[PDB]
Structures are given as C-alpha cells and as structure tokens.
Structure 1
C-alpha cells in the first residue's frame, strides 16, 4: 500500500477490538447510532493508547538519567491535526488503514473530522510545532511550554468578497490528545506593590490567578520517545475571587471569576505586529511565571534533591536547564528568573545574573519596527511593579558596562538603553533579551547578518560572541511523508527510508535526474496531487478549476511586506494581455492566493477584497476561457496547507528584499516538487544557493538595491510614467473596472501604491512579469520542468528542522542529539 508501515495480522486484530472497546465504553454509543465523528474519536482514542506507555517511560527515563532539560517557551504552537502524524511516527498508518477498512470505514474520511489545533498565527507558531517534532526525533529532554487558548486563530469566512472572522471553538467536541493535570496547578501573581524590608524586597498585596496545566504528547519519529507539550489554562481561586467581602453580590462574585480566566481565552491574531494591550502582557507573564516554577521544581529534585554538594546551589542550574525564548513574547522570563533567585532564594545579584544569562537564549524573528515589542512603563508599573524595578536595575548595570567599553559615547548609551524616553516611556523587550541571554540568533543567514549590521549593531560591537544564526527548517514527517505519501514512496523506492530522519540523503536523488522512469513518476505524483486538490475544491468549496494548468500559489498571512499586491498586478497583466490578443496561445494558469488578515489590519483586508474582485472579473470573462482562473483559498491553515502545497507547481515568495526574516512555506514547497519564483530574501537565498541559481527563478532588487533606492528616495510616479502596462492597471483600479457598483472602492490601495508604498511594489514589477514569462516558457517543456523540480527536491535536505535543532543543541543548548531508539514501549507496571 506504501511504507506507512506493516499491516500485521496480530495488530490489525488488536486494533479493531480496541476501536470497539472505545466506541462502547468511552463514547457510549452502539454501531447503530454512531456517526463519522464518533468513529473518528474511537480511532483517536485507540491510537492515543499506543503512546501512553512510551510517554510514561520517556518521562520516567529523564527522571532516572537526569539529563540537561530544554524548555521552549512560546506563546504560539501551531499544531494542526494530530491523528495521522501520530500514526506516522509510531508506524501505525497501514495497520489503522487496514483495521478501519475491515470495520468498513474510510480512514481518510475520519481524518478530515479532526479539528486543527490552531494555537498559532503563522510562521513563528508553526516553527515551534516543527521544532517540537524534531526535538523528540533527536532524543532531547525537551518541553514545549505555552498557553492553552480555548479559541485559536479565528476561522476565516469570505462574505461578498470580504473576510468575516468567527470564533474557532476547537474544543467544542473535546480534545482526545490532552491530559488535564489539575493536581499540578500553580499560582501566578498580578498587581500588588513592593515592600522593602530589612532583608529584601517583597511583592505584596497581589491578585492571584491559578495556572492549570494540560499535557499533550509529542512523539519522536519511530524512536519510542514521547516528549511533553505543557499548556497552561487560567483558573480563578475560589477564595478571594469570592472571599474579599463587604457587599457586591454573591452571584456577581461567582460570575466575575471569568475575568481572571479570560487570560487564556483567546490568542491574539496578529502576525508580525505588536499590540500593547494589557490582556496580552498578562498572557505573557502568565506563561512565564507558571513555567518557571515548574522548571525550578524539577531542578530542586534532579539529583540535588537527593544529595550532590548539598546546599541548593544554583551554580549547576545552567548545567541542567536551558530556556529558549521564541521571540520577545516570553521575555519576562529574564526578570522573573532574577526575582525568584534574588527575592525568594536569596542569591546575591551578581550570582543570580550569571545564572540567568547562562540559561537563557533569545531568537529574533523580524526586523520590521511595528512588530517590535515596546511596553509602556506605566503598564509594567501597575501590573508587575517588582519586575520593573529589576529591569531598571538590569539596565543600570548594563549601561555601566557600555560606558566603560565606549567612554564618552553618549549617544550609544541612549540607543542601547532598555528604556526608551519620549512621548511615553517604554521598555524595549528586545534589548532586555540580548542583555540577559548568552546567545541571540537570527532565523536565516541574511536576516542574521542584518541584525548585526543594522538593528542590533551596537549590541554586536559590545558582545560579538552572543550573535549567531540558525536557519529555520521544517519537519519532513508532516511536510513530506504525511501530506505527500505518493512522493515519499517513489523516493523510498530508489533510496530507501533512512532519509525521513536524515533528509540530506535526498541528494542521492541527483543521480536519477536523467532517469526516465523517475522523471515520469515525479511528474505522475504531482499530477495525481493536482487532481485530488482540484476535486477537494469542488467537494468542499464548489466551482471548478482546470488540473492541466500551472498551479500558481501564494499562501501565507496577508501582509504589505509579503506583497500579495505584486502578485495581483501580475494577474491583472496576464488578463490584459489576453484581452489584447485573444487568439494567441498562453500557458494556462490557476493562480491561488490564500491567507488570513489580522482583524484590525485595514489594508490587508482591502487586499483580500481586491483578490476576490479580480477573480469576479477574470473568472467570468468568456474570452479568457480556461486559460486563467483567480481563486482565493479560504481559511488557510495547517490542514489546508497539507493539501495545496503538494499540488503546487509554482511557489510565490516575493517579499521585498530584507523584510521576510526567513520564511518556511518556501521550504515546504521546495521539498514537495514546486519551483520557486522569488526575491533574494530570507531563506530564499540559501535555497537557491543549495539548488543552484539556474534551478531557481530569482528576480527583483537585492537588499543593497533597496537601500540605494531609499538613499535616493522612492518615487512610484516614475514607474507609473515609464511603464504603460503598469499605468493601465492603476487606471483600471482607479476607475472601477474591478468594482463597478463602488468605483472608488480601491482608492486606498492606489493611493498607498502611489504615495506611501513602504515595500516598493512598483520597483520590482518589470523584473517580476519578465521572470514570470520565463517560468511559463519552462512549463511548456514538461521534461525539463520536472528535471528542475528533481534538482530542488534532491537539494532541499538542509531545510529539515532536524538540522536546525541539532545546531541549536550543539551551539546554544550544549546537548548532543541522539537517534537512539528508547527501550521499546513494552508494558511494565512498577
């Protein structure tokens, strides 16, 4: 059937009876009233049963051996569905497929019922998910720590061409994967004041919110390692949240509990944008405060909570603990670790600081200013008074270091301060992270260089040793074996299965680049993939596409820097050329644009309306026929990505040079047989460098050109004046060609494009459509297109998250990865 494992005789039988056990005893249903949803849960529970045994021994193991622990703090974990992934990592896929088949059910139909764990916005959240999978696969004693939002990223609905947001009640029917652990609930404090008494400061008169943990298993790839993702939930104490007496109402007091519990109710839907709301700051301290207590508790036991030197010496803390900050969201971990060590454990400042810096590491994910976290001091002042005092003290000592290093450099001092003066004083969280971490890294080579040359230049000059790079990656399990079994099979037919946990081995595919059968096969799976997606489209969304055309897709969050608008200009151009010479042949294309717009991002929502507007015109023009279709992919999410990427021919990664830190969708497309048209931005550079620029469609300004233009001054009118095709499009938008009933509908877009385009869309227009012509040319030659595809796939190995994690492990965490199978799952009951 494929190498989804063995469909053993004893195990298919075993699976079937357990499926029935759960349907009866767990779901309390009988075959006569069971629905596909019930069948999905019975299966989910049956599958979950197989990893609890391994989950328990893995955790017990780490307790016995006591290795260094890695704590990945992130406010986002974009997990997606987990049924299939679990089957794949446990080699259960074929057996489950067989068993359910014998039970008369279609596993694929049941898999579609599982709700996505959308506790993420985009790249940053999904990176965290891929990392978890890789850390498990590499045998690291790692823990994912976050917030259990009851409402993840909103579900997007298109109404009249506009985006409509609606609550993502992903827990509505329950989550069979998580395990509530109310017995490990911890208290978290807010507000209050600071008392300075005799021997130390005291955080007093605080409001208490409880943090209840929920553990979700994270299985490594076929190695019997099952790590843990711990998500905190906010709960109100039953005392003060009722007991602070003297009139108000008993009923009201109980109803008001949903004020402390609002902390974990919803994820902020912002991608690369900072919103300084109090609720957000609360979420940030909540995950940090709860997590740290858990970390220290584990440390106090270790082998120190037995003997060792005997005296809670936190000197070995950094040797046993490593906490990675996914961006600045969990940045409060630094002053919080200090607070606990100094205020509670009573360590001297300097010893505490040494420990803190040695256990913390910070990862930066963007350079755009509006995404940078700068919290107003009056907010920190009210909500976390002691942390503000600690931050000021950290700032004081850090600046003294600078002054001593750069005597008399008074501007450098203000530039480097953690405190920003002006309208309102703010705290620069990024500056805090650099000061309190022993390592700072970018997510792509160019992005990392930009940090050193630009944004964090002064910090780099001060401590050059802190700055590193760790190019992002993706997990070959979910992003290849899971979503594209067809491609994984044919690769396996030639080079084996060892590449799934050793993606570099894909290079061996280079020697089949002239293999006639392989070329035919690679081309076949892609055709099968396109057919299945074209079908899904009519199934779930309804209104035909042509599977023979070039599948041109751009899927990612809607942003001005991502330039979906530039994609728009090209689409309209294609349209206008066809209308000019109708009876001239052109390579057919289905251009699919999908992504979510943050609810408050007006421009982004205007772009979504533009895309649908273009489709309204283009898709109903008889002269165009089936040569050009414009489709907006609704509710783009992980589960939808697993469907479109394997069916894509052309991947669009056209952000303005220097704005996309890395990107990961680009890597997803490369490993799945799509060719990339893009700019020398983020990881695109390393991808082209790995496949060879001849096998990539690069165009546009490089970073240098962008800066040259800025020195000069960007004037969009120039481009409008010298390019008639561009001029024609702008006047079409301006006159209502794409919006008849509301002719001025797109005035904001035009206005922006002509007067305040921060991402110089026009500057890359000419080189973009010219480059697009080159891909159309190559698509006309199936054999050569496929051979170039093979060159990309065979060369994507470097982009696996296993590589990324191995580097973090060795160069930052100080731990050694291991592909050693944990000693079976085998029963056991001590």
Structure 2
C-alpha cells in the first residue's frame, strides 16, 4: 500500500515544534560537529556562536516554511518594500525573543558549559545600512511579520569607524569573512540584468539589444514576527560576472552602499535592485495559486518606493509589461500606478535625485524612451486642464531641460504612484502644500502622512528587559502588540514606589553600560553621573559642535570655582562622518582633544566625563539607549523630517533636550511640552533671523562664557600642539555657518541647567520620565504599519498564530 503520498513523508511533522532543552543541546551538537565540522577541542568561541545560531535558524525556518505555505494557500495580496539599504543589526537574540526561545537556549547553553553572552557578542552587525532609512526598513519588516502581512524586503547585499589621534579612521567591514548563517543563497533563482546596448524598433514591439549582462543572485534572510509563528523574507541581491576587465564592473554594483562613474555606479546599483526585484515579483505572481493574468496585478501586489532610489521600478515595470508581456501601453500604465506608492523622506528640495539624460541615455536607452513617453502623456494632461500656464508645465515636467537636461526622479515617482507620503505631520504637509504644490493641487487625495515609528521588540523587550519586565508587572503584556497600552502607566504617576523601581532599572542598565565604557575606552565611569547622549551621524546640521560648546562650558564652571554644586555628568557623543566630509572630520577631532583635557585634569574628577562612542551601530544603540538619561535631539529647526532615535530614547526612560522640529514636535503633543526640554528658535524664529542676516559677532562678546570656550578652542587651549588646527571651524562658524550655532547657544546652555535641576530631584525626574514613557506608544512601528495597510496597500493585519502542526 502507499503510493506517491510516499512523497508526503517529505515533511517537518516530527522536526518542528519540539523546543525543549534536550532537543536544543542535541541540535547544537549536530551543528557544531556536522554543520561546522569542528569539535569541543578545536572550536573557538566563534565556532560555538555559529552552532548556536544554526540551532536557532532551524526553528526560524520551520515557521518560515509554514508561513510561505500559508501564503501560497491563502493567496493574500503581497507587499514589497523596496529600499537600497536595510539596517539589520544582529539576528540571534532578536530571533530568540520573537520565537520565545531565550529561556531554553539560556539553559541549553549553560549545560554545555558556555557563556551565552560571549556567543551573542561574536556576531558582527550586518553591514546593510548606513542611516535612519535602513533602520526604518528593518523596523517595518519586523512589524509586518508581527502584523501578519505577506511582506518582503528587497534590497542590495553589500565600514568600521575607528578613532586614532582623536581622528576618525575608516576601516574595512568584513562582515562575511566567516559567513552569515542567517542567509541562504538561491543560485537557482539567478536573474540577468542588462545595461547599455541599444533599442531596435520593430513591428513586433521594441527590442533592447547588444546589452552588457550582470547576474543578480538572491540571498534570503528570514524575518520573524513576534510570537505568531509568522516568518517573512528579505531577499537581497548580489552581482556576479556572467562568464574582459569588466568581470568586476558587476561586483562594483554590490560592494559598498553610498559610494562621475561614482554617480554612474550608483545608477547601475539602483537599476540592478529594481530589475532583479520586479522580475522576481512578476515571477512570483505568475506562480500564484490563482483575457489576462495581469488584470489583477495591482490587487495582489503593492510595491513601496522608499525614497527615489528605486524610481526606475516605474519605467522598468512598464518595459516588462509592454515589451515583454506585450500589453497596451495604456493598460500597463493603469497596472503600474496602482502597484506603486512613494515614500518621501527628505525635507530638502535641493537633495532630490536628478540624473542627466545623456547618462540615463547611454546605460538605459529603452528606459529613457519610456520616461519621455510617461512625460508627454503627463504634461499632455496638464495642457488640457491649464492651457495658458506654460510655467506650471516646465515645472511639473519630469525632465529639467537646460544645460545638460536632467530627469527629476522625484517627479517620476509621483506621476507613477497612486499614493505619496511623508513621515511626520509638518513634513508631510510641506511635501504636499509646498514641495509638490502643483502635484497636490491636481490629485489632492494622492498625498498623505504616515508618521514614522519604531519597533517595540528590538527597542524594549530585547535591549531593555529591565524596563519591560517592570512595565509587564504593572500593565500586563499587551503593550507589546499594542504600545498605546503604555498609557495605563499614568495610573502610577503617584506610586512613589513605582518611580523607585523605575529609576532603579535605569541604574542597572546604567551600571552595565558603565562596565562597558571602562572596559572599552578605559576611563573611570561615574555610575551616578547623568548620562547625556547625542548619537546621530556626524554632520554640521546635526549640531554636536553645539553640545561640545556646552561640553567645555561645563568644564569651566568647574574651573572658575571648583566647589560649586555641580550635577555629575558623563557626556556621550557617537557617530560617523563621511570619509570625504572635511568639516565633520574636524568636529570629530575637536570632540576628541576636548575630551582628553576634561578627562585627565583631576580637578574635575568624577564630575564630568566626555566620550566619543566609536563605531555607532545598531547593536551599540542597543547598549547605550537603555542606559541614557538625557537624549540630545538638538538640530537647528526646519532640517529634520522625523527622528527615529528621538523615539527609542523616549521609550526607554531617557528624557529629551531639543528643538521644535522633526520628531520632537509629535513627542511634545503626546507627552506635553512641559515634559520635554524644548528651547532655541522655532522654525519661525529662524524664519526671520535670516532676513536680519546673521554674524556670530554679537553673540561672541555679549555672551561671556561663549567668549571663553569660543576662544579656548581657537586660542589652542584644547589643541596645545596645534592651536591653529581648528582654525578651520571658526572660519565656517563666523563666516559660513549655515546652521546658526551661537544663535541658540543661549537657550541651550540654560536649558541644560534646568535638567541638572530636575535631575537633582529624583522624584521630579521619574514622574516626568514615566510621562514620556507612557506616551511613546504612538511611535510604535506597528501603528505606522497598520496605517500603511489601510490607506495605502489595502491589505489587512492578522493576529493568526500560524500553526506549526497541520
């Protein structure tokens, strides 16, 4: 008996769902010996981490198998998140947290006589991010899995900041010298991507010929939802040479993110992601369990364009439909616009992608044609509605026809998407009312806001188990999948007991992070000190230099009368500066030398410490963030759209000091201004000071203490061996400081003094903090996703624990 139900023996029936200790030790031993081809006598700590990661993967995959099985079966509309970069951090713990295996693994690994913490620290950060964008993608991928959406993450598959002589010194990030156990290569799903060549017009549709081919290799990484047994995918592509000296012009496409031919190489990078991706989707949807097959394309596919990097998806989808599936250009266009939605992240108007036609022309000729065609019909519709206005015309035109005419990628994205959104109320308003005024005026509804958010898993359960364990006891464990549940904590604004545990939790995380700075940067760390952190990328606009000014200023208050009640302060400033950014590299040395002084002079002792947090990255943010008291979100008004970091710090018991811009604004709304340290010029206050004109002249003198530091710095005080070294900051401070530092030097320096004041009264602090913590549930990246699903993708969230046994 028994036939080709013999093939039904090929199952995970008895190899999925058994998550006990015996089983975990047994898998661990299988991997360390069989997968790794090692033994207890030859295995380094790295060998053990791997064996443990593999042990965890198996469970992740088990659910990924059932998950994909559910999607094929239910045939849900699918979401595709298209981003150049994905800031993933480390995988292990996160996976153990989401699958609920932390505890068994803890014990499994104790029994084998290994320190799980040691293993967990061997993992390098997946170099797939460089900013807040790659990190927004990563929260979304988490929230989509958790929210039960059939999402996918499409991007590329590619940096160690080190300090030396107080200077930043870039160094290579070999994140894959030993491999990535988390990812799987699908060579069997490779795809050819084409560059260059030419287009041949025939009666049997247009053809692109004589092209240079680059292969696109998919690497899959499982993305686990939180405890619903749901597991999504992040497919990242690598480039390969098909079979003279160009057998690397492929590799280049994938070797560094944010790299003339350095502009070009970026273009090929963007197209490579876009072509491979679209082909992949089309392939997946042609295989769905489900005239014309594509008629339903937009009801089964939603593609999200994170910024203008993958703006080629529009003409590329059109190229596929018309030249390949061969449908009418007008049908393909309706399928297109309904597929795509565009997310604008840049406040800027002078920072949008714009490629020169002559370039798009050589590399992607069939695409330029398609683009010119989208345009004509585009303007053609405009001329209809507004006959005279020849200005609205050339304005709204996808192409900037001038010197060497350029294509406006941002415009292409808008015409080709059914929905455009911003990431904060005021930001989304500028995008609609100003930046793309013309566009909004036309199809007004097309525009909208989706306030950024942050994942409660990585940024609380994982990093701050102290805080989580605490909250849990008071308001149960529903805040995890519903962060607006944190409100219920206000019911403790009185519980003086509570605030005790609370600040205690902050001390513990604050104490641990201490053992770290000492063991790392080797400097006595004042565990009682008020940890004040500013960890944004190193740039002019982000200030930091303004904090430094406040770094030194506090350094004098302890020198001009060394016995006046001063609130102890450990100041942390971390971040990276582009290897080409001359200025910031200087602000980096500046902060270093300054630190040296304020640290070694024994007069200040355990009063104030300065620390440059080297190699700021996801995993580091995970160390600092929980142990921070004051969050430094102080960037000049009208420069920040959102501010993800702002939110991790408010979620974890830190308190915020900053301006009325970006995320601070919506934070004020939920907590209240009183519960936030606002200050400095409002966007309007600056909206005037420019007309008046600005010269650091005034502020310098009138502001005594300013003169101090201001000169201290220049007078070679912090730079003895080269006092004239920072003589480059002063010139672009007085003269060309496009960011008005001094102008706020007032509000700031004083502002802080109210902090030292609130800090001195513990009770005042903790009551305020709890007010910040119980108003952070709105900035959950789950709520941000719910929104996207309703008003954009038209897909519904699910709380269906996928079944392991079926």
Structure 1 length normalisation: TM-score? 0.93
Determine which of 4, 12, 16 is the counterpart of 2:21. Answer: 12
Determine which of 217, 240, 249 is the counterpart of 1:235. Answer: 240
Match of 1:209 in 2: 214
Q: How does 1:126-137 map to 2 (within 5 A)?
A: 126-137=135-146
SS in 2 for 1:448: helix
SS in 2 for 1:99: helix
Match of 1:241 in 2: none
Q: Number of residue pairs matched?
A: 790
Contact 2:357 2:406 survives alignment (8 Å): yes
SS in 1 for 2:615: coil
- Any idea what the Cα deviations from partners look like across 1:340-368, whole Å, max 9, x if unmatched? 11221222222221111111011011123
Match of 2:257 in 1: 267
- Any idea what the Cα deviations from partners look like across 1:417-472, whole Å, max 9, x if unmatched? 22123443221111111111111111111111122232222222222111111111
More divergent stretch after superposition (725-734 vs 595-604)? 725-734
Match of 2:269 in 1: 283
Determine which of 582, 592, 595 is the counterpart of 2:572. Answer: 592
Aligned equivalents of 1:10, 1:77: Cα separation in 2: 30
Contact 1:701 1:764 survives alignment (8 Å): yes
Match of 1:489 in 2: 469
Aligned equivalents of 1:788, 1:729: Cα separation in 2: 32
Match of 1:60 in 2: 69
Q: Does 1:550 align with 2:530?
A: yes
Q: Does 1:105 align with 2:111?
A: no
More divergent stretch after superposition (205-214 vs 733-742)? 733-742
- Any idea what the Cα deviations from partners look like across 1:99-118, whole Å, max 9, x if unmatched? 11111111111100011112
- Any idea what the Cα deviations from partners look like across 1:101-141, whole Å, max 9, x if unmatched? 11111111110001111211110000000000000000001
Contact 2:668 2:675 survives alignment (8 Å): yes
Aligned equivalents of 2:392, 2:262: Cα separation in 1: 26
Determine which of 12, 21, 29 is the counterpart of 2:38. Answer: 29
Deviation at 1:536, TM superposition (A): 1.0
Contact 1:284 1:329 survives alignment (8 Å): yes
Match of 1:453 in 2: 433
Match of 1:308 in 2: none
SS in 2 for 1:80: coil
Match of 2:396 in 1: 416
Aligned equivalents of 2:412, 2:802: Cα separation in 1: 39
SS in 2 for 1:641: helix
Aligned equivalents of 2:30, 2:311: Cα separation in 1: 46
Determine which of 770, 779, 782 is the counterpart of 2:750. Answer: 770
Aligned equivalents of 1:370, 1:497: Cα separation in 2: 45
Do the aligned partners of residues 404 and 717 (structure 1) sit closer, same or farther apart at CA in structure 2, a change above 3 Å counting? farther
Q: Does 1:781 align with 2:761?
A: yes
SS in 1 for 2:332: helix
Deviation at 1:726, TM superposition (A): 2.1
More divergent stretch after superposition (693-702 vs 800-809)? 693-702
Match of 2:637 in 1: 657
Match of 1:358 in 2: 338
Match of 1:298 in 2: 284
More divergent stretch after superposition (508-517 vs 529-538)? 508-517
Contact 1:122 1:556 survives alignment (8 Å): no
Determine which of 604, 607, 610 is the counterpart of 1:627. Answer: 607
Deviation at 1:721, TM superposition (A): 4.2
Determine which of 395, 413, 416 is the counterpart of 1:433. Answer: 413
Aligned equivalents of 1:162, 1:370: Cα separation in 2: 30
Match of 1:218 in 2: 223
Aligned equivalents of 1:736, 1:424: Cα separation in 2: 47
Match of 1:243 in 2: none
Aligned equivalents of 1:581, 1:395: Cα separation in 2: 69
Match of 1:753 in 2: 733
Match of 2:11 in 1: none
Contact 1:73 1:326 survives alignment (8 Å): yes
More divergent stretch after superposition (620-629 vs 317-326)? 620-629
Deviation at 1:545, TM superposition (A): 1.7
SS in 2 for 1:117: coil
Match of 1:330 in 2: 310
- Any idea what the Cα deviations from partners look like across 1:177-220, whole Å, max 9, x if unmatched? 11111100011000001111223221111011111111100010
Match of 1:248 in 2: none
Deviation at 1:496, TM superposition (A): 1.2
Deviation at 1:258, TM superposition (A): 2.4
Return 5+ residue gaps in structure 2 as ranges: 1-16
Match of 2:182 in 1: 177
Supply the RMSD in Å over aligned alpha carbons.
1.7
Structure 2 length normalisation: TM-score? 0.96
Do the aligned partners of residues 600 and 778 (structure 1) sit closer, same or farther apart at CA in structure 2, a change above 3 Å counting? same
Q: Does 1:674 align with 2:654?
A: yes
Aligned equivalents of 1:718, 1:401: Cα separation in 2: 54
Deviation at 1:10, TM superposition (A): 7.3
SS in 1 for 2:730: helix
Match of 1:792 in 2: 772
